[PDB]
Every structure is written in structure tokens, then in C-alpha cells.
Short mmCIF file of C-alpha atoms and ligand atoms in Angstrom, two decimals:
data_model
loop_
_atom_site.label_atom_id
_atom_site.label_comp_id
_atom_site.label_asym_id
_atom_site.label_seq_id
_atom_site.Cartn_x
_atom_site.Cartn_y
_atom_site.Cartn_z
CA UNK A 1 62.03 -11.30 -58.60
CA UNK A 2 60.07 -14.13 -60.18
CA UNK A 3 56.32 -13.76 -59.93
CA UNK A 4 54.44 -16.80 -62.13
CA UNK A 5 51.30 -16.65 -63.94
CA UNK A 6 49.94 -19.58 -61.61
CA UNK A 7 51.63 -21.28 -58.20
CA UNK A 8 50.07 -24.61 -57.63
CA UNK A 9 50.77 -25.69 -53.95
CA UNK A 10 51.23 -29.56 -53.62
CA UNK A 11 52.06 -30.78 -56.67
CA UNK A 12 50.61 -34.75 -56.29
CA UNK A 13 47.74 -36.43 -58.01
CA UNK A 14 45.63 -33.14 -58.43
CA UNK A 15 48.87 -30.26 -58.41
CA UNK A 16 51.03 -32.32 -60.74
CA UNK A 17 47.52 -32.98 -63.66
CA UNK A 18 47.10 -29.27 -63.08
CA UNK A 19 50.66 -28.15 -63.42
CA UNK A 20 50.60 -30.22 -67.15
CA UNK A 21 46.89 -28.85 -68.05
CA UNK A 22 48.63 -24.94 -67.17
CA UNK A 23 51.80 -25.84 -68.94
CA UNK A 24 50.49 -27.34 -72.11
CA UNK A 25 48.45 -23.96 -72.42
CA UNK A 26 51.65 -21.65 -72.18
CA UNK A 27 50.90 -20.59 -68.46
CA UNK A 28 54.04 -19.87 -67.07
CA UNK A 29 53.24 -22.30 -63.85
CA UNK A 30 55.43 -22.44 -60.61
CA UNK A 31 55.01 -25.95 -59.02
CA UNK A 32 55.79 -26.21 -55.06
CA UNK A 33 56.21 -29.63 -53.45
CA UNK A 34 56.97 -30.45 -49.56
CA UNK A 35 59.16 -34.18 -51.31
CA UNK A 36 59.55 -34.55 -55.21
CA UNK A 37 56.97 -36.12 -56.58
CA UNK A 38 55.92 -38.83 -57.14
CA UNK A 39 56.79 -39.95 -53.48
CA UNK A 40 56.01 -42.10 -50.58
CA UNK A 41 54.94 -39.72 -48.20
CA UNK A 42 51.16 -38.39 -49.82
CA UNK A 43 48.07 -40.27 -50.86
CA UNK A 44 49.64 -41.65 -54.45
CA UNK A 45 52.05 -44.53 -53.87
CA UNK A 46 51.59 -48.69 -53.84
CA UNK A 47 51.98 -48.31 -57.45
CA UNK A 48 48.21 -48.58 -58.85
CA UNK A 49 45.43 -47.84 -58.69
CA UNK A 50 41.92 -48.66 -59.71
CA UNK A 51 39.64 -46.47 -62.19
CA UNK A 52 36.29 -47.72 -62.75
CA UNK A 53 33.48 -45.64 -64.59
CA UNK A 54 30.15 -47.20 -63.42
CA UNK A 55 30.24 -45.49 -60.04
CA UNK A 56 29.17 -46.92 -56.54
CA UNK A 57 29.99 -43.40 -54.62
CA UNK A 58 27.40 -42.07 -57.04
CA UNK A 59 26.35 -41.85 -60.57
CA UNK A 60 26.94 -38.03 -60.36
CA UNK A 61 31.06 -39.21 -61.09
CA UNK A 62 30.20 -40.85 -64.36
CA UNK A 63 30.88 -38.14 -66.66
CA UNK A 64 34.42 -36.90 -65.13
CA UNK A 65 35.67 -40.46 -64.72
CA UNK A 66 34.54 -40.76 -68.74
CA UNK A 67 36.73 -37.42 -69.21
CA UNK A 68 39.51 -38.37 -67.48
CA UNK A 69 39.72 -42.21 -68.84
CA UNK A 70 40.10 -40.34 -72.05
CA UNK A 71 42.71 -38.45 -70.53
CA UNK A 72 44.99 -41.30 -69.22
CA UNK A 73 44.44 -42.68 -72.50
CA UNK A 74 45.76 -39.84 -74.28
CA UNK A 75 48.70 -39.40 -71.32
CA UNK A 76 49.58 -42.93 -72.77
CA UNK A 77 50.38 -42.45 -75.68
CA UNK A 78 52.20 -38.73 -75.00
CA UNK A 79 55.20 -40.70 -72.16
CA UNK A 80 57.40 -43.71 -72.28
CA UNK A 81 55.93 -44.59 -69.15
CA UNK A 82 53.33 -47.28 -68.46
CA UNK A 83 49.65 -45.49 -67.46
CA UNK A 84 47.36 -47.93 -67.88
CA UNK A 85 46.20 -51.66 -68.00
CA UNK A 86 42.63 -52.69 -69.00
CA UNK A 87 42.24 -55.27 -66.54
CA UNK A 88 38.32 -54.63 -66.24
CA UNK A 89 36.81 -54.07 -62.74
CA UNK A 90 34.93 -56.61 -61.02
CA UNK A 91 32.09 -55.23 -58.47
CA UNK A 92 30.38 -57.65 -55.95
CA UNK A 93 28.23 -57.83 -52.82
CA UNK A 94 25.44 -59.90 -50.67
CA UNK A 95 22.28 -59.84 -52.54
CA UNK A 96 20.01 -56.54 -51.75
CA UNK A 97 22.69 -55.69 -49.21
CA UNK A 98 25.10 -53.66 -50.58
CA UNK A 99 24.22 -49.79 -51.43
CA UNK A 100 27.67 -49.71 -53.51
CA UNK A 101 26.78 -52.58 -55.65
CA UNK A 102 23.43 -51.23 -56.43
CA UNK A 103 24.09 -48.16 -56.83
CA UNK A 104 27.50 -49.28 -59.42
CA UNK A 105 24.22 -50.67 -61.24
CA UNK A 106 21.84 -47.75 -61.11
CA UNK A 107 24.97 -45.75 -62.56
CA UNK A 108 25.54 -48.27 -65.55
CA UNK A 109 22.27 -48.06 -66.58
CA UNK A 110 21.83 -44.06 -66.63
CA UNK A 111 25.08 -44.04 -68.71
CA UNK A 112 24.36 -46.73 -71.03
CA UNK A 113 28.23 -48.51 -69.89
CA UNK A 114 28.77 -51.73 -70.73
CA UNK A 115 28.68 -54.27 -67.95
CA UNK A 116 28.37 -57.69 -67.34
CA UNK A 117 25.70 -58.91 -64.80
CA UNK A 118 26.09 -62.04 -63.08
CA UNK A 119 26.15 -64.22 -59.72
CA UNK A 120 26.60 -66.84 -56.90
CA UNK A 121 28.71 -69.80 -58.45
CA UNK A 122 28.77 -68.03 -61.93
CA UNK A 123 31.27 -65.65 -60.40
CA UNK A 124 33.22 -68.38 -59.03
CA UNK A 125 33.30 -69.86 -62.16
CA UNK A 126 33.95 -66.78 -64.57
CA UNK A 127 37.66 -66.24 -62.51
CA UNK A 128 39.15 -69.48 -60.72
CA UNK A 129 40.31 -68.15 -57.84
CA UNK A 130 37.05 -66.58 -56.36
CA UNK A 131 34.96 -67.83 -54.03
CA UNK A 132 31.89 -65.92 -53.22
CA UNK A 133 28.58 -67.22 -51.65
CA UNK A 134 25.71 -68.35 -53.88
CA UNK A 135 23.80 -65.62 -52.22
CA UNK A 136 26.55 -63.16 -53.75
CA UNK A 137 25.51 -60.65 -56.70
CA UNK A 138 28.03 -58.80 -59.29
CA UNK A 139 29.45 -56.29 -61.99
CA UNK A 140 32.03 -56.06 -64.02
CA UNK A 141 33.02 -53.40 -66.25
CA UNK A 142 35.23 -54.89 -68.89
CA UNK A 143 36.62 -51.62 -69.98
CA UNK A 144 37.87 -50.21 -66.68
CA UNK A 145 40.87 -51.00 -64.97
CA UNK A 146 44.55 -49.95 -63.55
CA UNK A 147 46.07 -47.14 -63.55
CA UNK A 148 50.16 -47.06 -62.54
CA UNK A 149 49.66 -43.35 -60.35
CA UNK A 150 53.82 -42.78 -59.96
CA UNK A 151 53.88 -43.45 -63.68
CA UNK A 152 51.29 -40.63 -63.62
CA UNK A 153 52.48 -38.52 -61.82
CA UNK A 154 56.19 -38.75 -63.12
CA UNK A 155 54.73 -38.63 -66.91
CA UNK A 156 52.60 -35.51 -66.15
CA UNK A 157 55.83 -33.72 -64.38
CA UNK A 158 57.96 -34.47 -66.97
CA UNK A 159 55.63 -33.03 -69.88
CA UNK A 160 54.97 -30.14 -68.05
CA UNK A 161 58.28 -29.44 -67.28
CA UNK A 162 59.47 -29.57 -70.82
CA UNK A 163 57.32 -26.89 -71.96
CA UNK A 164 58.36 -24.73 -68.85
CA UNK A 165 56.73 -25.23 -65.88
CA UNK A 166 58.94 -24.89 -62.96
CA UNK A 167 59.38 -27.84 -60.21
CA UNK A 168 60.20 -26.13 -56.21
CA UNK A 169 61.23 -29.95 -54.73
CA UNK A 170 61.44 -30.81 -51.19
CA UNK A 171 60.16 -26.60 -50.23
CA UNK A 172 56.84 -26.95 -47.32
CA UNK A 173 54.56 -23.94 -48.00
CA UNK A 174 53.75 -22.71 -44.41
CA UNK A 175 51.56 -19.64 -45.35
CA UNK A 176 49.76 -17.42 -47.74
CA UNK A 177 49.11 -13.92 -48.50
CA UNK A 178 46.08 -13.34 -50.75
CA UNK A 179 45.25 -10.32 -52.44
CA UNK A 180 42.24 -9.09 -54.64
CA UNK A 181 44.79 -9.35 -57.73
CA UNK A 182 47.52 -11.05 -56.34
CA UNK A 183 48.70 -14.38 -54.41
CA UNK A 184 51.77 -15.27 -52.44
CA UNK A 185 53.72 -18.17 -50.60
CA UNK A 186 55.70 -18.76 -47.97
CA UNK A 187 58.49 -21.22 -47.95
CA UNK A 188 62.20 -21.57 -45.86
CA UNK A 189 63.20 -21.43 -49.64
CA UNK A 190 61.66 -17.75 -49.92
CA UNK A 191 58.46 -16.47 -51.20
CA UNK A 192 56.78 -16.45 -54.80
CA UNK A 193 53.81 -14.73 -56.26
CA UNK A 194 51.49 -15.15 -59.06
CA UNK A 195 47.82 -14.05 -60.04
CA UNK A 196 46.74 -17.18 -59.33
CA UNK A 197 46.84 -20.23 -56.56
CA UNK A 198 45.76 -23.90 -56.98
CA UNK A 199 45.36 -25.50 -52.97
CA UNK A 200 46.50 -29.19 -53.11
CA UNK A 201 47.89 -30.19 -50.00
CA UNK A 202 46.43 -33.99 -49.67
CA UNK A 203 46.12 -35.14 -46.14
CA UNK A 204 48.11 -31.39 -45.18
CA UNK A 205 44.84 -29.57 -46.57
CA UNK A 206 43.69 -30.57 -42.88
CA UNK A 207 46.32 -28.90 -41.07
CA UNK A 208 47.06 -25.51 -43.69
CA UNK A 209 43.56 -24.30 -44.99
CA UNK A 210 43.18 -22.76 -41.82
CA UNK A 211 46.09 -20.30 -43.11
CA UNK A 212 43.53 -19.46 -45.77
CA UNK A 213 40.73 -18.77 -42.99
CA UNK A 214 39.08 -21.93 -44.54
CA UNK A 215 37.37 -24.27 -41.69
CA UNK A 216 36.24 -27.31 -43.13
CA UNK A 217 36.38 -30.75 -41.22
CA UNK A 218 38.75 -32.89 -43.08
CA UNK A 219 40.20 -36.30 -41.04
CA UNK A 220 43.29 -37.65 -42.78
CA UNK A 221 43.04 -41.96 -42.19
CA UNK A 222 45.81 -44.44 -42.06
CA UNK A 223 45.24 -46.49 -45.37
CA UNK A 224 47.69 -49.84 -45.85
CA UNK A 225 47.55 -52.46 -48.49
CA UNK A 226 49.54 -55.58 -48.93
CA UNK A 227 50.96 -57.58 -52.10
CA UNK A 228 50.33 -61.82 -51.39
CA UNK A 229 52.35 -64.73 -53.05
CA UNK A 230 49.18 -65.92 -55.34
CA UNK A 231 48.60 -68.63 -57.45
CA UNK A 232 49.80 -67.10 -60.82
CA UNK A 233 48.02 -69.64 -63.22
CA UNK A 234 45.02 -67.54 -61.17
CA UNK A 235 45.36 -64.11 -59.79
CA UNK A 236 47.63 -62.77 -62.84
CA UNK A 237 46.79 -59.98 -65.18
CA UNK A 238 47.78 -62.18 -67.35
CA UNK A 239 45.08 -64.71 -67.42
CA UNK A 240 42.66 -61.64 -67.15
CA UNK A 241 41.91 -61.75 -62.87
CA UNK A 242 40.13 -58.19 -62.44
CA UNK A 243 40.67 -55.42 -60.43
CA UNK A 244 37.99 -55.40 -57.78
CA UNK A 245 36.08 -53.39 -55.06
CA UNK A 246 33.57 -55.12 -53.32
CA UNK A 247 30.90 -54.69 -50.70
CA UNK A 248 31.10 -57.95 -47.86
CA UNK A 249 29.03 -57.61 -44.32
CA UNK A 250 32.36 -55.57 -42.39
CA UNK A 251 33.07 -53.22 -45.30
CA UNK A 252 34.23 -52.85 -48.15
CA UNK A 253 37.42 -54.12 -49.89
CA UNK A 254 39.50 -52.55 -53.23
CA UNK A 255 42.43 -55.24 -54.72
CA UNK A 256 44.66 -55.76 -58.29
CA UNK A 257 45.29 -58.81 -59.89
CA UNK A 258 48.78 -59.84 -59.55
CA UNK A 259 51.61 -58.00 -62.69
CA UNK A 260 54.33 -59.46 -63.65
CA UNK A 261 54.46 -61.85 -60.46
CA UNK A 262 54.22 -59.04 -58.21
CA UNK A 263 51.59 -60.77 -56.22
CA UNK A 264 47.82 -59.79 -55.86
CA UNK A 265 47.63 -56.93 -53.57
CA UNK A 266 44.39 -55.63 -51.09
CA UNK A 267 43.45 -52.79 -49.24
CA UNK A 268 40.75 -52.56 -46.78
CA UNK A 269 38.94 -49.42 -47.68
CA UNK A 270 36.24 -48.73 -44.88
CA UNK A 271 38.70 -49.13 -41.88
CA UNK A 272 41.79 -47.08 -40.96
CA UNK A 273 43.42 -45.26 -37.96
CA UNK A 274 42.89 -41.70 -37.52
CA UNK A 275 46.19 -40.09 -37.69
CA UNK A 276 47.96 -36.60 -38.72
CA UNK A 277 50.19 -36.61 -41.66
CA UNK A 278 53.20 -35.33 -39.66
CA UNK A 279 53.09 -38.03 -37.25
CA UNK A 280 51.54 -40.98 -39.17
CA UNK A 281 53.62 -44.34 -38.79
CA UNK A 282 54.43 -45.49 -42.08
CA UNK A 283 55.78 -48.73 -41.52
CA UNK A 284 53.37 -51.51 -42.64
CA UNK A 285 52.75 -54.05 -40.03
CA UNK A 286 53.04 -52.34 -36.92
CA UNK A 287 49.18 -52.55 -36.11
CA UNK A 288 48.78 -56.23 -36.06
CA UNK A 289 45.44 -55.29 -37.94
CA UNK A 290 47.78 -53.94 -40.95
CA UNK A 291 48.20 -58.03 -42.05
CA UNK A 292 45.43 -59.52 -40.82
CA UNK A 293 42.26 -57.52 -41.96
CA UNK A 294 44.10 -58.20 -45.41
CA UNK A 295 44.07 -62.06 -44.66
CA UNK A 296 40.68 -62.23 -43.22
CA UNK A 297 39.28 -61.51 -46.51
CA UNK A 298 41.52 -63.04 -48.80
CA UNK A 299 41.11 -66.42 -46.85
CA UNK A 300 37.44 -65.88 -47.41
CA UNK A 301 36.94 -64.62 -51.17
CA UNK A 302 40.30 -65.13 -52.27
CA UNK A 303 41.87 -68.21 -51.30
CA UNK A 304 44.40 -68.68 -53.38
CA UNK A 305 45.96 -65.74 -53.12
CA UNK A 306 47.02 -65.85 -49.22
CA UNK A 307 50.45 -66.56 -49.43
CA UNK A 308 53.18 -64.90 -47.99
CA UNK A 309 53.34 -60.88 -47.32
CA UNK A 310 55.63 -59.85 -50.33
CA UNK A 311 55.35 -55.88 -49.35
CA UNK A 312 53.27 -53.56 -47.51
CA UNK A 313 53.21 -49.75 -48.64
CA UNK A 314 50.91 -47.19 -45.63
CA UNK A 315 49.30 -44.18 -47.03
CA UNK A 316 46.79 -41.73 -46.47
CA UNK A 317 43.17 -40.72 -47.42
CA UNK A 318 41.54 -37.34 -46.30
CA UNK A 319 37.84 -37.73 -45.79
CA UNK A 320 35.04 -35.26 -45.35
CA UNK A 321 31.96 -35.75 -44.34
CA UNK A 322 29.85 -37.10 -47.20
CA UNK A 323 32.82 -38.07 -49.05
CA UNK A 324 32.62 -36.21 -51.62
CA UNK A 325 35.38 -33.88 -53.32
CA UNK A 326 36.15 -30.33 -52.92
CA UNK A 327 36.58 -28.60 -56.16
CA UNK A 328 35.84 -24.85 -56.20
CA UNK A 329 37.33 -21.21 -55.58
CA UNK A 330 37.92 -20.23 -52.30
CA UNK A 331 34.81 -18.43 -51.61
CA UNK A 332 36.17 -15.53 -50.53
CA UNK A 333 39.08 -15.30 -53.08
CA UNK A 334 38.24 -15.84 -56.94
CA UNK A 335 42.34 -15.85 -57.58
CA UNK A 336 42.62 -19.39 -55.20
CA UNK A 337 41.06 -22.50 -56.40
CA UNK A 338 41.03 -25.51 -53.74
CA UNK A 339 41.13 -29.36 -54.58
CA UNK A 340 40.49 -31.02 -51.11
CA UNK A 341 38.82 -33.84 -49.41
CA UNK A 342 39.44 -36.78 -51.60
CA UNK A 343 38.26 -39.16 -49.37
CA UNK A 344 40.24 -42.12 -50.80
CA UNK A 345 38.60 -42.66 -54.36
CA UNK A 346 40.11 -39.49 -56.50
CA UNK A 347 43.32 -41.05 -57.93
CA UNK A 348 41.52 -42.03 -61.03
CA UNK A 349 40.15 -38.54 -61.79
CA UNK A 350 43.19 -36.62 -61.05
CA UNK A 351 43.49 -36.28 -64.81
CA UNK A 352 40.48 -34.83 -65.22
CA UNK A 353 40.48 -32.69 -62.03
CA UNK A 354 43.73 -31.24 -63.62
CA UNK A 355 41.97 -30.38 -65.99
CA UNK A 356 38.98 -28.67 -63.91
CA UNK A 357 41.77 -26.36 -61.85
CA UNK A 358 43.42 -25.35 -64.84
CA UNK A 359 39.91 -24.01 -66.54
CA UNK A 360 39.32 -22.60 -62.57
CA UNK A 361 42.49 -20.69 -62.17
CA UNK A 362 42.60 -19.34 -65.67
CA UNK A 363 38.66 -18.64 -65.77
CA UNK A 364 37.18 -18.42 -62.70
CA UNK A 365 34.53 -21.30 -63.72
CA UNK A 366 34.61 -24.62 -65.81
CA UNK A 367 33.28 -26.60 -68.46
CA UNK A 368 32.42 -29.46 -66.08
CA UNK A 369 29.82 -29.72 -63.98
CA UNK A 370 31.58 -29.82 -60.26
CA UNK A 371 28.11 -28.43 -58.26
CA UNK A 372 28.23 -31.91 -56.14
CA UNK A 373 31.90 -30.97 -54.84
CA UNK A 374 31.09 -27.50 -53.79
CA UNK A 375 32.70 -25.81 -51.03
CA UNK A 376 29.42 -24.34 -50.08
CA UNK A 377 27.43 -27.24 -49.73
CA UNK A 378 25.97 -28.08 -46.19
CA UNK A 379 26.70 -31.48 -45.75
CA UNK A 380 30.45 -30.44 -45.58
CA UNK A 381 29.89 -28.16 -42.59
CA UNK A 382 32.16 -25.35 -44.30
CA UNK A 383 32.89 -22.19 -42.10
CA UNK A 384 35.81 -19.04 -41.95
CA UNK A 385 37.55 -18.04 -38.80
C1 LIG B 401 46.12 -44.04 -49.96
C2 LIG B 401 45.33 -44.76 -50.88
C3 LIG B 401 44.59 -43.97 -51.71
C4 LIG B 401 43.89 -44.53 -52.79
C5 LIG B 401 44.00 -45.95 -53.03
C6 LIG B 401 44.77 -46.79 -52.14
C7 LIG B 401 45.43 -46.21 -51.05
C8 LIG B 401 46.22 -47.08 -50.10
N1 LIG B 401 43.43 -46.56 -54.11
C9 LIG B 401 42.74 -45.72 -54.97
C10 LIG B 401 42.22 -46.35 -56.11
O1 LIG B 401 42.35 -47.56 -56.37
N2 LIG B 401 41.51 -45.50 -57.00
C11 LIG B 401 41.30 -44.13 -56.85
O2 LIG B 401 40.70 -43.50 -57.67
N3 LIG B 401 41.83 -43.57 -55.72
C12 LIG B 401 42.52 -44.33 -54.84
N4 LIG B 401 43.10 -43.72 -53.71
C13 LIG B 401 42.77 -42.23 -53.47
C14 LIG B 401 43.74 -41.33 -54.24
O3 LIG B 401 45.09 -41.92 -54.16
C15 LIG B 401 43.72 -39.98 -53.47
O4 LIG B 401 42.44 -39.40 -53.49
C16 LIG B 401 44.80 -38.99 -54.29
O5 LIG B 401 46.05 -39.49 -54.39
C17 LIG B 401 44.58 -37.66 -53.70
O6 LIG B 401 45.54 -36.76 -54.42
P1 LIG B 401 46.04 -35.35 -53.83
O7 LIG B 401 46.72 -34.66 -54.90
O8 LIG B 401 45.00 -34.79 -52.97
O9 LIG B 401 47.14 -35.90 -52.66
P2 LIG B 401 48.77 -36.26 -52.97
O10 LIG B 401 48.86 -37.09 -54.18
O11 LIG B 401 49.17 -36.75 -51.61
O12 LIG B 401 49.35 -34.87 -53.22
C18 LIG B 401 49.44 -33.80 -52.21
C19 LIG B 401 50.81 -33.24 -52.34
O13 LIG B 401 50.94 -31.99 -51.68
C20 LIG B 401 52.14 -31.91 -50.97
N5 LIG B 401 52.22 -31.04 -49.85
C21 LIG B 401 51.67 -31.25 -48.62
N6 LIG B 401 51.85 -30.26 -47.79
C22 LIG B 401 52.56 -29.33 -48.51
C23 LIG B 401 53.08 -28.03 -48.21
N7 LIG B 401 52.91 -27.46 -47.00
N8 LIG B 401 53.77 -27.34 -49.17
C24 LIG B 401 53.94 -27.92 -50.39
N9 LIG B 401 53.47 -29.15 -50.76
C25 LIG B 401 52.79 -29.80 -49.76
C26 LIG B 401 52.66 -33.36 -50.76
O14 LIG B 401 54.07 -33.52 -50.63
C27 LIG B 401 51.97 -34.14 -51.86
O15 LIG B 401 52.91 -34.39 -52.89
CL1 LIG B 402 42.24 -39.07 -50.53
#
């Protein structure tokens, strides 16, 4: 005997933002969670993450990752807890061989950001610490950088649950019932309605969209990262050692300078084992490739930062076929709005995206333009049962 105005299933990265853009507007919002966020179980542990606004994946990702850079900004200044560090992001790559790198450039340009420009040995020079080949381009973005995504997450479920919005902890959803003016959930807990459903399962959009006839190819991946013993007087926020993604001949490779002695830490970002999220090991170190793709780049292009393993953390992207986002209604229901298919890079727009599902649920359309994450689109290979 409790219906809500809005039930948000999955309340991570994109539920939680959401949940906080719904609350904020009076929308009496019903939150339901398979752990109690933030956790270690999803896509949003490891502590930070990297936003950048010049973007590799596509220019097309400038203007939300403007929006929602504004957004952690202002999330800073509304919670106690940390959000974010302008550490700058540093973007290299082989000359004329990386698409990422170029296309980082392309997107600076279009958008007027400011960048830096700059190569071989003056890279290597710029941060101590480095060690690229002469034959080795860049880009940094001094005004990107780290974002703490528990912090987030904890800050944005805390707000939203002091102006009402209700938190279901540790309650799977295992199936819905949609109506023309109506939706409902199923839980062991019980069941809960509402006029309107938000679809954020992470890596478990791949196993439950099917319960909302929705047959799109989604591949959760096995994603680790490490933290190394560094050099300090090198790899340390402190003496301004970017966040990085770069582009080197077997992939491509996303790391964090070191906070607070923590270590640097890397994640190979191109490689991972296909895996479900119910059965995923989560133990770091139990592929012998969980250590040592880490150390086969750091020993390369970061040297001094190869020290000893100080933790591991295993978590999970959800890919689709081009990559690229799902942000839309369900197409057969206007009352369900779905945020899928991350692919590993959506972290940093999770503020924003709240901010998209919110305008969704409550208005069937939004003031941003999400046409490249359509459900419809054909390089997705979309279908119903
Ligand atoms: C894994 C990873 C990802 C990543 C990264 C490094 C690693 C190792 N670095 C990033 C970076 O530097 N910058 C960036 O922008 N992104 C980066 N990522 C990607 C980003 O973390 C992911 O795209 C993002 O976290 C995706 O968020 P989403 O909201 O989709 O996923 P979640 O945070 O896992 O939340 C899903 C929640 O839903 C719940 N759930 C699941 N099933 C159910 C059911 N049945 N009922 C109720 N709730 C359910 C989960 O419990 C989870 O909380
Ligand atoms: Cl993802």
C-alpha cells in the first residue's frame, strides 16, 4: 500500500544520480538496490575514476561530459565528501597510430577546450616518471581529472534521501509488470508500483531486460586494476602526475596518479574475460594476467611506478556493440526509461545521465541531445521477443 511517483531499479552510478535529480524535484522516488550502495559488487568501486572532456570515444560526448563536470562540481560543494581532484588528464599514443588520440584532438578543437599539445622526449620531460618513445604524440587537458565514484555515489544517496527518497537495500528485482499507466516490481521483499520506471541494472541489464521483452546484445567483461608502490617524489597527485588513458600497439591503458601514498594504480581497458555477473570471480590475481598485463606496461611507460602490488579491486563493464550508451524509453513503454550498455567509460557522466532519466521519466523526452545512445539505432542490433 505504497505506490511511488518513480521506482528506479539499480540504484549505482546512473540509479543513485537519478534518484537525487527525482528527489531534489519533490518526486516521491522509491530506490531498489540488489547490495547498498555504493558497493563492491557493480561497475563503481576501486575508488576513482577518470573524467576527461576532450573525448577519444567521440566528440559527440563533449557536451554531456561539460554538463556533468558542472555537476560534480556543484555535488562538491552540496556533501562533506570528497568528489573531485583536478589532476588534469594526460592522453598519448604512437604517432598517426592511434584513432583515440586523434580523435581526443579532433574533439578539442570542435569544442574550443583547452589542451596542451606536445611529444616524444617533451613528454618525458613535462612528468619525471614517463617514458614514452620519441615517436610518441600527446594531450593533456589540464582541467579534467578524478572523480572519487563511492564518494559519489554515497553523497548523491545521502542528499536524496534527506529530502525523501526511499532506499530498498540488499532487495534483487526479478521481474516487472508494465502497464500503459502503471509500472510494477518484483522483489522476495514484495512488490511496489509507481507511474514510472528507470532500468539500471549494470552488468545485470544483460541477464533482466529480457523480463522487459528487450533483446539487445550486452557482454558484461571482467575489468581489474591494481595500486603499485611508486616513487612518490614522482607519481603523486601531489607533485601534479596526471591521470592518463593512452593508446600503445596492444591496447589501450586508463591509470591515477598516486593520493595520499596510495600508490599509482592501472587498469588495462581493451582486455578482459567474458564473464556473468552472478558467477564472476572477484578476487584479483587469480588470472595470472590480472598482475602482469598491469606490469607489462608500467615497466614500459611507467617505470617507476612498478613496485609492489599494494591492492587489486575486479569489476565489471557491460559493452555493446559500438560502445556506445543506451539512454532512451523503452520503445514499447513511454512509462520505462533504460540506462544500459556503458561499456566501461560512463562513470564520469553518471551525473549528468541522472540528470537525463530524471527529465525522461518525468517528461517523456530531454533537454539533451541523447540521439547517438538510442535504443533504436542499428549498430546495436536491438530486437523484442
Ligand atoms: C569497472 C570499471 C569501470 C570503469 C573504470 C574502471 C573499472 C575497473 N574506470 C572508469 C573511468 O575511469 N571513467 C569513467 O567514466 N568510467 C569508468 N568505468 C565505467 C563506469 O564505472 C561504468 O560505466 C558505471 O559504473 C556504470 O554504472 P551503472 O549504474 O550502469 O552500474 P553500477 O554502478 O554497477 O550500478 C548498477 C546497480 O544495479 C544493481 N542491481 C543489479 N541487478 C539488480 C536487481 N535485479 N535488482 C536491483 N538492483 C540490481 C546493482 O547492485 C548496482 O548497484
Ligand atoms: Cl560499464
Amino acid at each position: 500500500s505504497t505506490h511511488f511517483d518513480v521506482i528506479v531499479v539499480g540504484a549505482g552510478s546512473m540509479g543513485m544520480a537519478a534518484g537525487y535529480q527525482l528527489a531534489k524535484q519533490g518526486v516521491k522516488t522509491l530506490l531498489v538496490d540488489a547490495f547498498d550502495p555504493p558497493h563492491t559488487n557493480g561497475s563503481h568501486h576501486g575508488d576513482t575514476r577518470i573524467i576527461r572532456h576532450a573525448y577519444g570515444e567521440g566528440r559527440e560526448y563533449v557536451p554531456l561530459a561539460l554538463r556533468s563536470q558542472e555537476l560534480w562540481y556543484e555535488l562538491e560543494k552540496e556533501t562533506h565528501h570528497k568528489i573531485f581532484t583536478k589532476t588534469g588528464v594526460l592522453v598519448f599514443g604512437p604517432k598517426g597510430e592511434s584513432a583515440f588520440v586523434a580523435e581526443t584532438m579532433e574533439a578539442a578543437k570542435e569544442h574550443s577546450l583547452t589542451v596542451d599539445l606536445l611529444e616524444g622526449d617533451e613528454i618525458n620531460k613535462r612528468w619525471p616518471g614517463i617514458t614514452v618513445p620519441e615517436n610518441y604524440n600527446a594531450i593533456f587537458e589540464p582541467n579534467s581529472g578524478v572523480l572519487f565514484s563511492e564518494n559519489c555515489i554515497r553523497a548523491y544517496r545521502e542528499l536524496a534521501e534527506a529530502r525523501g527518497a526511499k532506499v530498498l537495500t540488499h532487495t534483487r528485482v526479478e521481474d516487472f509488470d508494465i502497464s500503459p499507466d502503471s509500472v510494477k516490481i518484483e522483489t522476495a521483499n514484495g512488490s511496489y508500483t509507481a507511474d514510472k520506471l528507470i532500468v539500471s541494472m549494470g552488468a545485470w541489464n544483460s541477464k533482466l531486460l529480457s523480463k522487459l521483452n528487450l533483446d539487445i546484445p550486452l557482454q558484461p567483461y571482467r575489468q581489474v586494476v591494481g595500486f603499485f608502490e611508486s616513487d612518490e617524489s614522482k607519481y603523486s597527485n601531489d607533485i601534479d602526475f596526471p591521470g592518463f588513458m593512452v593508446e600503445v600497439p596492444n591496447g589501450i591503458y586508463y591509470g591515477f596518479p598516486s593520493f595520499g601514498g596510495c600508490g599509482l594504480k592501472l587498469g588495462y581497458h581493451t582486455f578482459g574475460q567474458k564473464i556473468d555477473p552472478d558467477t564472476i570471480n572477484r578476487e584479483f590475481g587469480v588470472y595470472p594476467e590480472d598482475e602482469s598485463n598491469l606490469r607489462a606496461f608500467l615497466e614500459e611507460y611507467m617505470p617507476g611506478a612498478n613496485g609492489e602490488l599494494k591492492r587489486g579491486a575486479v569489476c565489471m563493464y557491460t559493452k555493446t556493440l559500438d560502445e556506445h550508451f543506451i539512454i532512451d524509453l523503452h520503445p514499447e513503454h513511454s512509462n520505462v526509461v533504460i540506462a544500459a550498455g556503458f561499456s566501461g567509460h560512463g562513470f564520469k557522466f553518471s551525473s549528468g545521465v541522472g540528470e537525463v532519466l530524471s527529465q525522461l521519466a518525468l517528461t517523456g523526452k530531454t533537454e539533451h541531445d541523447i540521439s547517438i545512445f538510442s535504443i533504436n539505432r542499428p549498430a546495436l542490433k536491438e530486437s523484442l521477443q
